[PDB]
Design a protein around this motif. Structure first.
Motif, PDB file in Angstrom:
ATOM      1  N   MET B 390       0.768  -1.236   0.000  1.00 12.31           N
ATOM      2  CA  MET B 390       0.000   0.000   0.000  1.00 12.31           C
ATOM      3  C   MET B 390       0.800   1.287   0.000  1.00 12.31           C
ATOM      4  SD  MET B 390      -3.130  -0.832   2.371  1.00 12.31           S
ATOM      5  CE  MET B 390      -2.222  -1.044   3.906  1.00 12.31           C
ATOM      6  N   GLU B 391       2.123   1.191   0.124  1.00 10.78           N
ATOM      7  CA  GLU B 391       2.991   2.377   0.096  1.00 10.78           C
ATOM      8  C   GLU B 391       3.424   2.690  -1.318  1.00 10.78           C
ATOM      9  OE1 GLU B 391       6.134   2.082   3.199  1.00 10.78           O
ATOM     10  OE2 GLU B 391       4.374   2.140   4.537  1.00 10.78           O
ATOM     11  N   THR B 392       3.699   1.644  -2.090  1.00  9.88           N
ATOM     12  CA  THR B 392       3.995   1.754  -3.522  1.00  9.88           C
ATOM     13  C   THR B 392       2.732   1.641  -4.405  1.00  9.88           C
ATOM     14  OG1 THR B 392       4.486  -0.636  -3.741  1.00  9.88           O
ATOM     15  CG2 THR B 392       6.282   0.814  -3.095  1.00  9.88           C
ATOM     16  N   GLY B 393       1.730   0.883  -3.964  1.00 13.38           N
ATOM     17  CA  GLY B 393       0.552   0.569  -4.789  1.00 13.38           C
ATOM     18  C   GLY B 393       0.791  -0.534  -5.820  1.00 13.38           C
ATOM     19  N   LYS B 394       1.886  -1.283  -5.660  1.00 16.30           N
ATOM     20  CA  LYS B 394       2.223  -2.409  -6.515  1.00 16.30           C
ATOM     21  C   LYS B 394       1.550  -3.666  -5.999  1.00 16.30           C
ATOM     22  CE  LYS B 394       6.680  -4.075  -6.893  1.00 16.30           C
ATOM     23  NZ  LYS B 394       7.451  -3.725  -8.125  1.00 16.30           N
ATOM     24  N   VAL B 395       1.077  -4.498  -6.921  1.00 20.24           N
ATOM     25  CA  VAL B 395       0.470  -5.788  -6.605  1.00 20.24           C
ATOM     26  C   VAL B 395       1.462  -6.895  -6.948  1.00 20.24           C
ATOM     27  CG1 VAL B 395      -1.351  -7.404  -7.304  1.00 20.24           C
ATOM     28  CG2 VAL B 395      -1.867  -4.963  -6.957  1.00 20.24           C
ATOM     29  N   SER B 396       1.669  -7.822  -6.019  1.00 14.29           N
ATOM     30  CA  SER B 396       2.592  -8.950  -6.206  1.00 14.29           C
ATOM     31  C   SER B 396       1.893 -10.280  -6.481  1.00 14.29           C
ATOM     32  CB  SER B 396       3.474  -9.092  -4.972  1.00 14.29           C
ATOM     33  OG  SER B 396       2.684  -9.280  -3.817  1.00 14.29           O
ATOM     34  N   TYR B 397       0.603 -10.364  -6.185  1.00 11.31           N
ATOM     35  CA  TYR B 397      -0.111 -11.603  -6.342  1.00 11.31           C
ATOM     36  C   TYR B 397      -1.590 -11.349  -6.638  1.00 11.31           C
ATOM     37  CZ  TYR B 397      -1.901 -16.221  -5.329  1.00 11.31           C
ATOM     38  OH  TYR B 397      -2.508 -17.458  -5.433  1.00 11.31           O
ATOM     39  N   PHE B 398      -2.091 -11.966  -7.719  1.00  8.44           N
ATOM     40  CA  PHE B 398      -3.532 -12.089  -7.989  1.00  8.44           C
ATOM     41  C   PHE B 398      -3.960 -13.552  -7.847  1.00  8.44           C
ATOM     42  CE2 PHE B 398      -2.347  -8.345 -10.539  1.00  8.44           C
ATOM     43  CZ  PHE B 398      -3.356  -7.451 -10.204  1.00  8.44           C
ATOM     44  N   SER B 399      -4.937 -13.820  -6.981  1.00  3.86           N
ATOM     45  CA  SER B 399      -5.471 -15.171  -6.795  1.00  3.86           C
ATOM     46  C   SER B 399      -6.331 -15.571  -7.973  1.00  3.86           C
ATOM     47  CB  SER B 399      -6.324 -15.245  -5.525  1.00  3.86           C
ATOM     48  OG  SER B 399      -7.575 -14.600  -5.697  1.00  3.86           O
ATOM     49  N   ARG B 400      -6.669 -16.855  -8.052  1.00  5.84           N
ATOM     50  CA  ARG B 400      -7.699 -17.331  -8.984  1.00  5.84           C
ATOM     51  C   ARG B 400      -9.021 -16.646  -8.621  1.00  5.84           C
ATOM     52  NH1 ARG B 400      -7.464 -22.614  -9.494  1.00  5.84           N
ATOM     53  NH2 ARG B 400      -5.965 -23.260  -7.870  1.00  5.84           N
ATOM     54  N   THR B 401      -9.940 -16.578  -9.573  1.00  6.38           N
ATOM     55  CA  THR B 401     -11.289 -16.105  -9.300  1.00  6.38           C
ATOM     56  C   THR B 401     -12.149 -17.248  -8.818  1.00  6.38           C
ATOM     57  OG1 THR B 401     -11.629 -16.324 -11.660  1.00  6.38           O
ATOM     58  CG2 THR B 401     -11.493 -14.080 -10.729  1.00  6.38           C
ATOM     59  N   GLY B 402     -13.205 -16.879  -8.101  1.00  9.15           N
ATOM     60  CA  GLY B 402     -14.227 -17.805  -7.633  1.00  9.15           C
ATOM     61  C   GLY B 402     -15.608 -17.227  -7.862  1.00  9.15           C
ATOM     62  N   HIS B 403     -16.638 -18.031  -7.623  1.00  4.53           N
ATOM     63  CA  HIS B 403     -18.014 -17.576  -7.852  1.00  4.53           C
ATOM     64  C   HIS B 403     -19.039 -18.409  -7.107  1.00  4.53           C
ATOM     65  CE1 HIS B 403     -17.396 -20.746 -10.876  1.00  4.53           C
ATOM     66  NE2 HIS B 403     -18.683 -20.983 -10.689  1.00  4.53           N
ATOM     67  N   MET B 404     -20.082 -17.733  -6.653  1.00  3.12           N
ATOM     68  CA  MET B 404     -21.177 -18.344  -5.915  1.00  3.12           C
ATOM     69  C   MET B 404     -22.473 -17.691  -6.350  1.00  3.12           C
ATOM     70  SD  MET B 404     -21.396 -16.356  -2.362  1.00  3.12           S
ATOM     71  CE  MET B 404     -23.093 -16.857  -2.336  1.00  3.12           C
ATOM     72  N   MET B 405     -23.581 -18.172  -5.813  1.00  9.73           N
ATOM     73  CA  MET B 405     -24.881 -17.601  -6.147  1.00  9.73           C
ATOM     74  C   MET B 405     -25.809 -17.730  -4.966  1.00  9.73           C
ATOM     75  SD  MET B 405     -26.922 -18.283  -9.689  1.00  9.73           S
ATOM     76  CE  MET B 405     -25.830 -17.147 -10.506  1.00  9.73           C
ATOM     77  N   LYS B 406     -26.730 -16.794  -4.853  1.00  6.60           N
ATOM     78  CA  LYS B 406     -27.745 -16.830  -3.811  1.00  6.60           C
ATOM     79  C   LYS B 406     -29.056 -16.444  -4.452  1.00  6.60           C
ATOM     80  CE  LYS B 406     -27.016 -15.928   0.690  1.00  6.60           C
ATOM     81  NZ  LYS B 406     -27.467 -16.549   1.968  1.00  6.60           N
ATOM     82  N   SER B 407     -30.099 -17.230  -4.206  1.00 11.04           N
ATOM     83  CA  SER B 407     -31.441 -16.955  -4.706  1.00 11.04           C
ATOM     84  C   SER B 407     -32.345 -16.586  -3.553  1.00 11.04           C
ATOM     85  CB  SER B 407     -32.007 -18.172  -5.403  1.00 11.04           C
ATOM     86  OG  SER B 407     -31.274 -18.442  -6.572  1.00 11.04           O
ATOM     87  N   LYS B 408     -33.200 -15.589  -3.777  1.00  8.87           N
ATOM     88  CA  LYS B 408     -34.243 -15.210  -2.832  1.00  8.87           C
ATOM     89  C   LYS B 408     -35.572 -15.347  -3.526  1.00  8.87           C
ATOM     90  CE  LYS B 408     -34.302 -10.164  -3.656  1.00  8.87           C
ATOM     91  NZ  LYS B 408     -32.919 -10.106  -4.222  1.00  8.87           N
ATOM     92  N   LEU B 409     -36.665 -15.433  -2.767  1.00 14.00           N
ATOM     93  CA  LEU B 409     -38.011 -15.322  -3.329  1.00 14.00           C
ATOM     94  C   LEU B 409     -38.230 -14.000  -4.046  1.00 14.00           C
ATOM     95  CD1 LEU B 409     -40.560 -16.436  -0.612  1.00 14.00           C
ATOM     96  CD2 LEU B 409     -39.526 -17.840  -2.428  1.00 14.00           C
ATOM     97  N   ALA B 410     -38.967 -14.063  -5.151  1.00 13.31           N
ATOM     98  CA  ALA B 410     -39.542 -12.892  -5.786  1.00 13.31           C
ATOM     99  C   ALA B 410     -40.977 -12.694  -5.266  1.00 13.31           C
ATOM    100  CB  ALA B 410     -39.528 -13.078  -7.288  1.00 13.31           C
TER     101      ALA B 410
END
Ligand SMILES: [Mg+2]
Lengths: 411, 420
Positions: B390-410
């Protein structure tokens, strides 16, 4: 040598490993229904030590042990000779039986001080721990491995074993549209999740998408009938049932006298009385069905029909020490035919930690482990020929010197 | 095209599949503590259909989405200029930075929204960081639904998720950036039976199998932490039981919290990120230029935004008056605008109400019969993590992406997408 206290003795760390072990159990099906919710199954924190030779001795004799009870079960005359509501009930409509057994063992301290393998019990039918066993095995490999310690914790795939034997039974029935019936005592039965876990393995060892239908025995009165022409067992008037997997009465024998493969048929209940186990300890009685016979004799405990060295057991309540003489004189001779005398075993005591639901863990208990070896057959009871032997499996249960699931570490 | 009713409509069979699904959940950690026992998490029986293009659009923008909030979080004066929030600023002002390396995990939530032609477009509902739900539950529901679908004969359309692994891989990389072989990772919980506890434990089950040298993970509640955590007066390193250096503090849900925050342990993420994830800030990013400032990734982000105006009169049902961290609809929006005192004006904004995609599914709940053929609206959550300085603003690692879902009543339900 491996022993559990010399892993770790910081109570705060043992407590933290207890919670970890328990949370791994809650994440991996080591649970039962209570109340309806789920709760984890009590477990030893680390695998209890067990002699390598005796474990191999127990594993090796399982093939022989299935063959003896299978062949005794094919000889109804013999079983009757060895002994009333079950007999009254008992040609054959399905010769092919599926036969799964758990033999239980204690390492027993002979004089000299060295341990020998001795068989405590044989069980068939509504057998516990098909699904729980491979998971405890994994739990303990993880705890041991996570603590740095090390073929000494042998793989168990007993859920798979059961699945592979049901699949082979389904194939022997030979109807692509037939279903496998899981018969339970209730929806929240204590076998239910072990039963479901068998099916999770059955799915991944087939292409065929075999339907497994979970029915209670109450609902089976309306939903199961027998064909009057085929004598085949039908579910909802539409599905032929290839295998009835019994997971715990007129209906039961209507099922038993039908073309479905039983697991095992009722005749096996007669060959697994404690009377029969005691009868197999008499001279010649093993040799009759058969080297496999000598291997079997090594693990038997002489039991005599009708004081701190002995136990008075019932054959299907038991008395120790001076109570044996008390009960002998007291008892009426009608009751003498329902008990036998055996030598009390001096059981191996080891140290472990016990993890229980909603309580602090009990550290450094003395406990006595009990080794259960699983094995299954697929056999024809009219010929007495066996077409399939499953892989072997194994589990352990420790009690204080109420019990706990455990797994062996082969010292 | 795939839809859930055309799988099966025998109620007896649907009931039997409900019990099966539920018993698979009880066998595979899809559970929480209640009462103290465990209970399975409510779930949809089958995966709900979801457009392939929009899912890919959500997955693809995650890298950009982490980069924007990370860089905004490196610019304290920007965050201050864009504004409990008074209590958080007061704290951050007491603190230079003792640990430049932050671990930053985000869940962006999306709705497929029905525009006027009738075709669905991806629109972002929310961003979350910190004590994030569903790291451990997600890969398991994914497996549950692949199994149900497969067991019924139906068929890249149900994409693999290893989000428990994702979290593990990012914690391992954080531990390595701290660079102390004897240091531990701290899992800080609200209680022993916290709702995050088993998801936390499941992360560690993955961390074990992606390394040789057992990294010690220490599970402590925040109450116990008052006695067992102090800061070194020389290192400013965070120490547990006077013996163990803590490389990473994995926050799973106060003076102690900022004593931890102003120490050399890597935070997950540090408190500054709570300021960059207010709904005020999310609304501020919808104003012109405000995304472009940190950056194409910017245009991808603009596509999923919903214009939100700070503090209509013809189609007031198109809008909602939302709070920025309770909300007003229809003609109440005009009513509350005039009524409202100007003190309150700075805590609310106006946004376009989204017309959400309604699908049919079955809902399986603890100790009741399953609810068959409900209308439900799914909500897609995309996971991603950073490791950045956070002092330089450089990123050293990006993780894999993930995904989920949530359904509610309409009340809502865990779900997973079937890519129509
Ligand atoms: Mg109106």
């Amino acid at each position: 040598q491996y022993c559990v206290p010399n892993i770790e003795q910081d109570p705060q760390i043992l407590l933290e490993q207890s919670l970890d072990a328990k949370d791994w159990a809650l994440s991996n099906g080591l649970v039962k229904f209570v109340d309806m919710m789920t709760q984890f199954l009590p477990l030893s924190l680390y695998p209890s030590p067990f002699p390598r030779k005796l474990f191999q001795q127990a594993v090796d004799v399982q093939k022989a042990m299935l063959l003896l009870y299978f062949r005794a079960s094919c000889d109804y005359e013999f079983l009757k000779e060895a002994h009333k509501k079950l007999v009254k009930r008992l040609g054959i409509r399905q010769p092919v039986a599926m036969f799964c057994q758990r033999a239980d063992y204690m390492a027993s301290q002979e004089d000299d001080g060295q341990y020998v393998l001795k068989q405590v019990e044989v069980n068939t039918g509504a057998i516990g721990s098909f699904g729980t066993t491979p998971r405890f095995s994994r739990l303990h490999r993880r705890m041991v491995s996570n603590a740095g310690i090390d073929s000494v914790m042998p793989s168990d795939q007993t859920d798979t074993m059961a699945a592979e034997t049901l699949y082979q039974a389904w194939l022997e029935f030979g109807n692509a549209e037939a279903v496998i019936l899981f018969l339970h005592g209730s929806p929240n039965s204590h076998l239910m999740l072990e039963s479901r876990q068998i099916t999770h393995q059955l799915e991944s060892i087939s292409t065929e998408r075999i339907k497994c239908r979970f029915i209670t025995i109450t609902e089976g009165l309306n939903r199961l009938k027998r064909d009057p022409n085929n004598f085949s067992l039908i579910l909802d008037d539409k599905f032929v049932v290839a295998v009835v997997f019994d997971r715990l009465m007129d209906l039961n024998f209507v099922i038993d006298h039908s073309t479905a493969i039983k697991t095992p048929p009722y005749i096996f209940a007669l060959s697994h009385t404690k009377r029969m186990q005691q009868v197999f300890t008499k001279p010649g009685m093993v040799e009759k069905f058969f080297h496999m016979a000598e291997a079997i004799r090594k693990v038997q405990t002489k039991g005599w029909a009708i004081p701190h060295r002995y136990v008075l057991k019932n054959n299907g309540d038991m008395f120790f020490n001076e109570d044996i003489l008390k009960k002998l004189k007291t008892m009426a001779p009608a009751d003498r035919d329902f008990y036998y005398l055996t030598e009390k075993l001096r059981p191996m005591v080891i140290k472990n930690h016990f993890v229980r639901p909603n309580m602090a863990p009990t550290l450094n208990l003395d406990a006595t482990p009990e080794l259960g070896i699983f094995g299954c057959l697929l056999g024809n009871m009219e010929t007495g020929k066996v077409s399939y032997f499953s892989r072997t499996g194994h589990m352990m249960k420790s009690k204080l010197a109420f019990s706990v699931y455990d797994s062996p570490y082969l010292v």
